[PDB]
Amino acid sequence: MREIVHIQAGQCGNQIGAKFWEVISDEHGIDPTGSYHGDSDLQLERINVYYNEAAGNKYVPRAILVDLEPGTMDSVRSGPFGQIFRPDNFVFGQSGAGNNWAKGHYTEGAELVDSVLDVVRKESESCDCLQGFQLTHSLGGGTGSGMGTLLISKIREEYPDRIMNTFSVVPSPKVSDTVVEPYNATLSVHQLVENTDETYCIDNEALYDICFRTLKLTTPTYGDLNHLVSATMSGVTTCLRFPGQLNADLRKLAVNMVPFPRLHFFMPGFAPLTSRGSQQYRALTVPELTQQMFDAKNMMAACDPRHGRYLTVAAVFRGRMSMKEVDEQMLNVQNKNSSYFVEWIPNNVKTAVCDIPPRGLKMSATFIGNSTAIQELFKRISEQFTAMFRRKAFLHWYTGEGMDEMEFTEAESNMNDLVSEYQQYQDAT
Amino acid sequence: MREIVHIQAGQCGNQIGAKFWEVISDEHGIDPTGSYHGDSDLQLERINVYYNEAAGNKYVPRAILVDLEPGTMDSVRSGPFGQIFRPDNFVFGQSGAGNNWAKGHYTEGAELVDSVLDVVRKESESCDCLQGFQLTHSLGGGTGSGMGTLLISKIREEYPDRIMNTFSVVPSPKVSDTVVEPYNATLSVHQLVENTDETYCIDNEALYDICFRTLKLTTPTYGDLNHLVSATMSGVTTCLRFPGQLNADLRKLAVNMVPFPRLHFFMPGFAPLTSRGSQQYRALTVPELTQQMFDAKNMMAACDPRHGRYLTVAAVFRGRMSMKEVDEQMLNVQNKNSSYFVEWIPNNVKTAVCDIPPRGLKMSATFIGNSTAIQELFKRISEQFTAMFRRKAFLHWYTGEGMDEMEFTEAESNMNDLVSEYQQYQDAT
Amino acid sequence: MRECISIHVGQAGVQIGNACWELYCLEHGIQPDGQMPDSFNTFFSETGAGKHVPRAVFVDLEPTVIDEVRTGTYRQLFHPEQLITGKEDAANNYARGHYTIGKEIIDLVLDRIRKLADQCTGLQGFLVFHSFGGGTGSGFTSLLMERLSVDYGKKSKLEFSIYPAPQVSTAVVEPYNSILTTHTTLEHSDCAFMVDNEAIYDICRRNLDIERPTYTNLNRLISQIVSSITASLRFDGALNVDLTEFQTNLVPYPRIHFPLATYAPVISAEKAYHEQLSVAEITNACFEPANQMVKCDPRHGKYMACCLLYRGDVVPKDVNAAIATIKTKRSIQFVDWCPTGFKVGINYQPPTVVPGGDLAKVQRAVCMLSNTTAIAEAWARLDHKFDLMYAKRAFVHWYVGEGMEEGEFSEAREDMAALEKDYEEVGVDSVE
Amino acid sequence: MRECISIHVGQAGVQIGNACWELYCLEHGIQPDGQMPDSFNTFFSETGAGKHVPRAVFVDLEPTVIDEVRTGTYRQLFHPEQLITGKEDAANNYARGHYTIGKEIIDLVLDRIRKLADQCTGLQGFLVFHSFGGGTGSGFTSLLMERLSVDYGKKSKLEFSIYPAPQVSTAVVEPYNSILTTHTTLEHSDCAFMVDNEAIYDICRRNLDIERPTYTNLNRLISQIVSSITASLRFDGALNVDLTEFQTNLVPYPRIHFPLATYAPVISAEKAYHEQLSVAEITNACFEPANQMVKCDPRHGKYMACCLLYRGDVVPKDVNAAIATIKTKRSIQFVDWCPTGFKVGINYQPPTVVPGGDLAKVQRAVCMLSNTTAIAEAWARLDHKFDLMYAKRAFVHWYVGEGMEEGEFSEAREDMAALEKDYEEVGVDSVE
Ligand SMILES: Nc1nc2c(ncn2[C@@H]2O[C@H](COP(=O)(O)OP(=O)(O)OP(=O)(O)O)[C@@H](O)[C@H]2O)c(=O)[nH]1
Ligand SMILES: Nc1nc2c(ncn2[C@@H]2O[C@H](COP(=O)(O)OP(=O)(O)OP(=O)(O)O)[C@@H](O)[C@H]2O)c(=O)[nH]1
Ligand SMILES: Nc1nc2c(ncn2[C@@H]2O[C@H](COP(=O)(O)OP(=O)(O)OP(O)(O)=S)[C@@H](O)[C@H]2O)c(=O)[nH]1
Ligand SMILES: Nc1nc2c(ncn2[C@@H]2O[C@H](COP(=O)(O)OP(=O)(O)OP(O)(O)=S)[C@@H](O)[C@H]2O)c(=O)[nH]1
Ligand SMILES: [Mg+2]
Ligand SMILES: [Mg+2]
Secondary structure (H helix, E strand, C coil): CCEEEEEEEHHHHHHHHHHHHHHHHHHCCECCCCCECCCCCHHHHCHHHCEEEECCCEEEECEEEEECCCHHHHHHHHCCCHHHCCHHHEEECCCCCCCCHHHHHCCHHHHHHHHHHHHHHHHHHHCCCEEEEEEEEECCCCHHHHHHHHHHHHHHHHCCCCEEEEEEEECCCCCCCCCCHHHHHHHHHHHHHHHCCEEEEEEHHHHHHHHHHHCCCCCCCHHHHHHHHHHHHHHHHHHHHCCEEECCCHHHHHHHHCCCCCCCEEEEEEECCCCCCCCCCCCCCHHHHHHHHCCHHHECCCCCHHHCCEEEEEEEEEECCCHHHHHHHHHHHHHHCHHHECCCCCCCEEEEEECCCCCCCCEEEEEEEEEHHHHHHHHHHHHHHHHHHCCCCCHHHHHCCCCCHHHHHHHHHHHHHHHHHHHHHHHCC | CCEEEEEEEHHHHHHHHHHHHHHHHHHCCECCCCCECCCCCHHHHCHHHCEEEECCCEEEECEEEEECCCHHHHHHHHCCCHHHCCHHHEEECCCCCCCCHHHHHCCHHHHHHHHHHHHHHHHHHHCCCEEEEEEEEECCCCHHHHHHHHHHHHHHHHCCCCEEEEEEECCCCCCCCCCCHHHHHHHHHHHHHHHCCEEEEECHHHHHHHHHHHCCCCCCCHHHHHHHHHHHHHHHHHHHHCCEEECCCHHHHHHHHCCCCCCCEEEEEEECCCCCCCCCCCCCCHHHHHHHHCCHHHECCCCCHHHCCEEEEEEEEEECCCHHHHHHHHHHHHHHCHHHECCCCCCCEEEEEECCCCCCCCEEEEEEEEEHHHHHHHHHHHHHHHHHHCCCCCHHHHHCCCCCHHHHHHHHHHHHHHHHHHHHHHHCC | CCCEEEEEEHHHHHHHHHHHHHHHHHHHCCCCCCCCCCHHHHCEEECCCCCEEECEEEEECCCHHHHHHHHCCCCCCCCHHHEEECCCCCCCCHHHHHHHCHHHCHHHHHHHHHHHHHCCCCCCEEEEEEECCCHHHHHHHHHHHHHHHHHCCCCEEEEEEEECCCCCCCCCCHHHHHHHHHHHHHHHCCEEEEEEHHHHHHHHHHHCCCCCCCHHHHHHHHHHHHHHHHHHHHCCCCECCCHHHHHHHHCCCCCCCCEEEEEECCCCHHHHCCCCCCHHHHHHHHHCHHHCCCCCCHHHCCEEEEEEEEEECCCHHHHHHHHHHHHHCCCCCECCCCCCCEEEEEECCCCCCCCCCCCCCCCEEEEEEEEECCHHHHHHHHHHHHHHHHCCCCCHHHHHHCCCCHHHHHHHHHHHHHHHHHHHHHHCCCCC | CCCEEEEEEHHHHHHHHHHHHHHHHHHHCCCCCCCCCCHHHHCEEEECCCEEEECEEEEECCCHHHHHHHHCCCCCCCCHHHEEECCCCCCCCHHHHHHHCHHHCHHHHHHHHHHHHHCCCCCCEEEEEEECCCHHHHHHHHHHHHHHHHHCCCCEEEEEEECCCCCCCCCCCHHHHHHHHHHHHHHHCCEEEEECHHHHHHHHHHHCCCCCCCHHHHHHHHHHHHHHHHHHHHCCEEECCCHHHHHHHHCCCCCCCCCEEEEECCCCCHHHHCCCCCHHHHHHHHHCHHHCCCCCCHHHCCEEEEEEEEEECCCHHHHHHHHHHHHHCCCCCECCCCCCCEEEEEECCCCCCCCCCCCCCCCEEEEEEEEECCHHHHHHHHHHHHHHHHCCCCCHHHHHHCCCCHHHHHHHHHHHHHHHHHHHHHHCCCCC
C-alpha cells in the first residue's frame, strides 16, 4: 500500500541518501541489520512504503544506489547502516564521468543505464501500488546531472502516471564548486523542466548559513548538512507514513504546489532549527514554528523570497497540536505579509498535520515554498553559462563525447524562457 | 576582540619592547615557552588583545621586531623570553643606520620597509578586529626615528581608520646622547605631527631622577628604567584587557585628551613609586596615589607642568577602590590647582577604573597629561637645530643620502608652527 | 498581562540592569537559574516548564560589560539572544553611537524587540536605561528611540537617564554628548527620569553612613526607585498607578518631560531602630532637598507636579494628612496654574531588601517623581559648558570625522536655548 | 580497482620516482621488500603471498641511474622487468632520444606497459615523469607518448615535467630539447604539470631554512604534490576529485594544458610551533607568488582555472570561506569568460611524512593546480633562447647527424609561435 522507489546517484546523492535511510530506519525502529526493535505498532503499520520485508523478520530499503565510481559506494557499504541495503541494488561503474554531463548522459552512463533500469523495473513490479520515485543527486557533477537526467527520462517514459520527484543540490552563488558546473546544471535543468513533477532546490551555501547563523555551529560538517536535508525529506512523507488529522501525500502536495506544469521548483525549509544553549529559553510551540518558517534566513535555496512573490506554500506539521491554532497562524502570515503572496491565488497557503512527531521532539514543521524569487538563481546560471559558451570555453570536452553546440543553445533558450515565464507571473495582477 | 599590533624599531625600541612583553606575560600567566600556567580565567579572557593562539596551547606576541642592524635582535633572541616570539617576525637589515635619519627613512630603511610591511599586513589580517598599532622607538637615532616614521607613514596609508600610538624616547635637555640628535628628532617630529594619533613623550633624564630620588636606587640600570615605561604601557591597556567599573580604551583616551589634531603629545606618569624600606611607612590609598601623580618629579618628560597648563588629564586606576573617593580626589585637584588647568575646557579630567591590579600591588594609577609645557622641549629642539643648521654643520652626511635643505627648512617651520599653536592655547582665556 | 519590556544600553544601563534584575528575582522568588520552588509575569516570560526569563534586552557596542553578565551569577537567567554586543565601543562619541557604529546593530536590536513584543498580549511599553555622557548611551539611545517612535509610536517609553554632576565628571566631552542626545530624543520620549551620581553618593555618605560608596551601591539605590515605579504592576495595591498614568500626570507640556526621582527612607540598621518611620516623617524626608538624587535646589524653583508612590504598611487617610501639611509648607511653592499637585499611589507590598545590601529593612517606603522648574538651572549649566568648548571648536573634529555636520551642533544648541526659555516662561505666574 | 600506471623516464624521472615510491610505501605501510604486517592497490599489484609490486616502469637509456635502484634499499620492491635500461644515453640530444637510440627500446617499454595494463581492472590512466632538457626526457618521452596514444588513446595522461629555469641553466642545448619535445608531445598529452628547480630551491632556503638543499629535497617536495593529487584515489574523502576530472576542469582549450603546481604548508620543525595553520591561511599562502614552484609572476597574468586539493583535518565550510575572500582579492585576477574558477577536493588523510624528512608534520595541507596566462612569459623566453642559437645554427649539425631534418626545427618553432599567440588571444577580455 503506497510504495516509493528511492534512488541515489553519485557521491552527493549517495551520502545524503545514506543519512536519509539512517533517519528513516531510526524512525521506524529498524537497526543497522534490518531487524525491528521498535516499541509501537505504528512504526510497522506503514513500513512497506520504504521497506520490503524479507525472510526471518528483516527489512530492506526499496533503494537503488548508482554511481560511475566505486569508492563512495564502498564507503557507504562500510558505514554504519551500510549492511541494511540489498547488495544487488548497488549498481556501480569503474570509469567515473570526470564532472562531464556528456559522459553521464551519453557515454559511461549510457552503458550502465540499462542495468539500473532492469533493477528499477523489478522493484516496481514487486510493489502493489507504486506511488513513484525520488531521485537524490547534484546538478553540478557528471553522474548526478547527466546519468540522473537519463534515468529520469527513461523511468518517466516507462511510468508516466507515477510521480517523479527530485532532491537536487544546485550550484551556489559565492563559491564555484567546479569549473563546468554551469554547463552541467544548465543541461540538467532543461531535462528536469520537461520530465519531473517537482524539484526540491537544495543549496549548500544556504545550508552553511543556516548551520553557522541559526544552529550556531562554528564548524559544520557535510554530515550535518546532509542530516538537515534528510529531515526535510522525511517531513514530506510523514503524512503518507503515519496516522494524522489532516493527511497529505506526494500527489496532493504536487497538485497544491504546482499551478502550471513548468513551475515546479521548490525552496524547502525546516523548523525548528535551534542551538544547544538556545533550546530551553524558547518554547517550541506552533507560533514559534510559524515565525521560524516564513523568513529568508531559514530557506535552503540561495534566494530571498522578499525579492519575488510566493505563488504557493505548503506547510507540513508533525506532533500533537491544535489544528485551529495552526490555521490561525497560517491566516496571520498571509494577512500581514499580503504583498509577498501573488494575489490571483487566494488562500495560497496549504496545510498538512501528522500526529507522529520526529524523534526527540514535541513538534516540528516542514515547508515547501514555490517563489518567483528562484528565477534569480536561474538567471545567474544563464549568465555564467553565456560568459563561458560565447568563448567556447571547455567545449571540446563535451563535443568530444558527441555533443553539438545546438544542444547547448537549445538548453540555454529553454532556461531563458522559463525565467521569462516566472517573471510574467511575478508581475501579473 | 580588539587586537593590538606591537612594533619595535631600533635598539631602544627592541629593549623596551622585550621588557614590556615580559611584563605582559607575567600578568597573563604566560611562561617563557608561550604556555598558560596561570590560575584566573580573566588572564585568558582577553589574551587575544596581545597574543595569537598557536597550535597546541601556545601563545605568541603579535609583535614585530625591526632593526637595520642584527646585534640587538640577536641579544633579544638569546634573552629571557626570546624564544616566545615568531621567528619570521624579527625583520632585520645588515647595514645599520649610523645615527642618520636619512639612512633610516630614505636609504637602508627603504630597502627593508617592504619586508616589514608584508609581515604587518599578515598580522592585521590575522585579527578579526584590529584596534590599532603601538610603536616603541627613539627620536634621536636613525632606525627608530627615520625607519620608524616611514613605517608609520605606510601603516597610516594602509589603515587610516585604526589608531596609531607611539612611545617615543625623546632627547633630554641636559645631556645629549648623540651629536645629530636634534636633526633626527626634528625630522621625526615632522612626520609624527601629521601621522600619529597620540604620542607618549619619555625622557631618560626624568626616569633617572625618579629612580634615584623616589625609588632610592643608587645605581639604576637601563632595564630598570625600561620597567617604568613597561608599567605605563600596561597601565594604558588595562581597561581594554580586563573587566572594570568604568572601561577606557585607546579611542576614548584620544577623544578625551586630544582637543585639536596636532596637540597629542603626552607626558605619561605612574604611581605608586616606593623603595623596599619606604613602602611600609605609608599606606597606598587613592588620595595618596593622586598626590603622587600630580607633581613634577613624577613625570616621565623633563618639563615642569607648573610652567604651562594642562589641557586634559586622563587617570587610569587599577585595583579595588571606591569610585566616589576617586571622583572627590579628582574634583579636589581641579579646584585647588585651578591656575594649572585651561579655563575653556571644564571637567578636564578623564577617569577610568579597572578592577584587576598589577602584580605585587593592591592599587596603582597611570597618568596621561596633555600639557602646554611640552612646548619647552620643542623650543629647545628648535634652538639646537638652528645652532647647527645656520652653520650647515654635519649637513653633507644627510645631503649625501639624497636629502635637501628645503626638506629641513620645512620641517623646522612646521615645528615652530606647532610651538606657536601650543603657546596660543596656553595663553587663551 | 500588562507586560513591560526593559532595554539596558551601554555600561551604566547594563550595570544598573544587573542590579534591577537581581532585585526583581528576589522580589518574585526567582532563582538565578530562572526557576522558583502569577504577578512576576509583567517582567518575566515563561519557557518550557519551571523557568522564567526576563523581558529584557542588553545592548552595548563593546563586548566587555555584557561578557560579565554572560559569565556571571545570572548567566542562566537571561536568554543568550537578548544579550547584544558589537566589536568596538562608541568612544564617548555620540556620532559613533548614532551613526558609524550604531547602524551595525540597530536593526538586530529592533528585530529582537519585535520578537519580544510579539509574545506580549498587553504591552504597556518600555523602560530604557542609559547615560547621557557615553557615546552609546547618548548616540545609540537616540537612534533607538527614533526607530521606536516610528515602529510603535503610541506605546509608552520611559527613560532612566544618568545626568552628569555639576562639579564631578567622567569625560571631557560629556556636555556635547548630553546636549546632542537631549536634542535628538526630546520629541521622541514621553517622560525622562533624571538621576545624578554626586547626589546619590552624598546620600550614601550622609544617610547610610558609608565612607566609600561604590557604583554598585548607587545601582542598588536606583533599582529601589525602579521597583517602586513597577510595584503597582507587579503586585496588588489599594490605589494603583500604571505607566501611562505617570506621563499624563507628570508632564504638563510636551517638551517639559523631565521629572526627578527621590526615594525614602534610606537608612542603616544602626540608625533604623532609633526611629519609628511614619508616613508624615518619610514624606517630609522625601520633600526635603537633602534626599534628592539630582544636584539641584527646588527651594530656588517651583513644583509643577508630584507623584508619590507609597509601598508597604500604609493607610490612605494618613497619606492625605501628610500631603495636606506639605501643601501648607513655606519651602514648597507650586506653580499658579496647578491647584492640585500630587498623584498618589499606594501598594500593599513592602520593599524587600537585597541580602548584603546597604539599606535597612523597613515597613514602608515612598518614591516621589517630581517635576520642577529648578531643572532649568542644570540645563543652563550644560549650555554654558557646551558654549565654552564650542567657541574653540574643541574636540569637534572627532564628531565630524564620523559623519556629523557642524550645523547640527548649532542646531542642537539653539534647540536647548529654546528649551531653557520655555522653562522660564512656565515659571512665571499668570496675568490677572 | 582504479589503477594508476607510473612511468619514470631518464635521470629526473627515475630519481623523482625513487622519492615517490618511497613515500607511497610509508603511506600504505609497505616495507622495502613489498610486504606489510586495501587502498594501496591502485599503485601496488599483489602477487602470491604477502608481496606487493609497484604499478610502474622505470626507463633510462643508460644503466647507471637504474643500477642504483637495482643495488639499493628498494631492490626487492620492484620486479626486474619493470626496470629497463639501454647501453648508451641520448647525450642531451632530442634526436637520439626520439629516433636513433629510442627506437631500439620503445617496443620493449610498450610491451611491458601492455603487460602491466592487462592486470588492471579499472585503469584510470598514466603518470609520466621526466624532464624537458635531457635527450631522453625530451626525445624518448615524445616517442613514448605517441605510442601510448595509438595503443590506448582515451586514457588520461599526465606529465610532471621539470620546465627549464630562466637563470639556472644546466646544459646549453636545453632550449632545443624543450621546444622540440613540447612541439611533438602537444597533441598527445592531456595535461602537463610544470615545475621549476630555481623556485623549489628558493622555497627550501626561505621556508624550510635549509642552507644547502640537495636534489633529494626537491624530489621529496615533488612527491608530496604528487601524493596530494592521487590521495583522492588512494584514500576515502568527503569530496573527491580524480585524474579525469582535472583535465575537464583545468583545460579550456586543447593547447592550453599547462597548470602550475603549488604546495602548502612547507615548514621547519621550529616554525611549526609559532604559527597556527588554518585552511584560509594556507590557501592564502598557496595563492601568493613567493610560494610558487615555477619562477613566474601570476600578478602579471590571469588565472583561468584553479583546482585546490585539501588533505587532513579540513572542514568544507572553512574552505568555502577561504576561497570567498581570495575571490575578493584585487591582486588575483581571473579571465572574464570564467565566472567559476575553482574545483575543490577535500580528503581525510593528513600528508604522511618521511622519517628524517625536512618538512614538519602538519594537520592540514593543500596542493593547488592552477592554469595561468603567466606561462606565456616562459614560452616567450624559451623562444627567444631558441632564436639566438638558431640564427647561428649553433649545435644544429649534431641533431641533423642523428637523423633530424632542419625543416622540423623551423616547424617546431612556428608551432610554438602559434601557441604563444593562442595564449595572448585567450588573455584579452570579452567584447560587448
Ligand atoms: N550610576 C551609575 N553611573 C554609571 C555607571 N557606570 C557608568 N556610569 C556613568 O555613565 C557615564 C559614562 O557612560 P558609560 O555608560 O560608561 O559609557 P558607554 O554607554 O559604555 O559609552 P561608550 O563606553 O562611550 O561606548 C558616566 O557619567 C559614568 O559616571 C554605574 O554603574 N552606575
Ligand atoms: N627536479 C629535479 N630535476 C632534475 C633532477 N635531476 C636532473 N634534473 C633536471 O633535469 C634536467 C637534465 O635532464 P636529465 O633527466 O638529467 O637528462 P636525461 O633525461 O637523463 O637525458 P640524457 O642524459 O640526455 O639521456 C635539468 O633541468 C636538471 O636540473 C632531480 O633529481 N630533480
Ligand atoms: N550536501 C552535499 N553536497 C555535496 C556533497 N558532495 C558534493 N556536493 C555538492 O555537489 C556538487 C558536486 O557534487 P558531486 O558529489 O561531485 O556530484 P557527483 O555527480 O557525485 O560527481 P561525479 O560522480 O559526476 S564526478 C557541488 O555543488 C558540491 O557543492 C555532499 O557530500 N553533501
Ligand atoms: N629608555 C631607554 N632609552 C635608550 C635605551 N637605549 C638607548 N636609549 C636612548 O635612545 C637614544 C638613542 O638610541 P639608539 O638605540 O641609538 O637608537 P637607534 O635608532 O637604534 O640608533 P641607530 O641604529 O640609528 S645608530 C638616546 O636618546 C638614548 O638615551 C634603553 O635601553 N632604554
Ligand atoms: Mg562603554
Ligand atoms: Mg641521463
